[PDB]
Amino acid sequence: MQVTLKTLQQQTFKIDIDPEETVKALKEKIESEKGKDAFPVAGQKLIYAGKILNDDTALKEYKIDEKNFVVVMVTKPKAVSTPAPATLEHHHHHH
Amino acid sequence: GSHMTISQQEFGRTGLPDLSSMTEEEQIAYAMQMSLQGAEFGQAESAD
Numbered sequence: 001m002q003v004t005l006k007t008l009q010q011q012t013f014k015i016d017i018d019p020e021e022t023v024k025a026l027k028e029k030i031e032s033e034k035g036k037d038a039f040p041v042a043g044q045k046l047i048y049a050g051k052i053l054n055d056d057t058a059l060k061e062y063k064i065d066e067k068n069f070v071v072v073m074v075t076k077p078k079a080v081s082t083p084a085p086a087t088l089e090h091h092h093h094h095h
Numbered sequence: 096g097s098h099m100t101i102s103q104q105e106f107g108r109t110g111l112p113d114l115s116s117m118t119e120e121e122q123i124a125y126a127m128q129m130s131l132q133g134a135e136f137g138q139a140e141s142a143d
Binding site for chain 1: 119129131143
């Protein structure tokens with residue numbers, strides 16, 4: 001089940017998670033996909049329809065949709081892997 | 096001061112910070128409002 005994710009920085013992604021599993025498994029997939037540096041299980045929180053998801057409760061209990069979005073946040077730090085000018089590897093053109 | 100001493104509630108913070116001014120509770124309430132509005136609640140304050 002391909003839940004759409006949204007961040008506090010207003011970035012958006014998707015997570016193909018098993019709806020047979022609990023909210024802890026959604027957290028596991030987020031840590032798996034984004035890495036422990038961005039979103040560790042122990043530091044991320046999960047929010048749907050204005051309510052925090054209980055990690056031990058199942059995904060079906062909140063009727064999460066694929067086209068709608070869940071919100072994920074991470075406490076204390078706010079740093080992320082920003083990009084840089086990839087053109088530096090050539091810095092010239094055919095023109 | 097001998098003036099009327101009242102103020103104008105007509106104004107406020109339009110564009111929220113990138114979390115820099117918000118407590119953990121305020122960062123949470125911002126997270127709530129986003130998913131709540133996605134759930135079609137129409138930007139109301141009613142969290143349930």
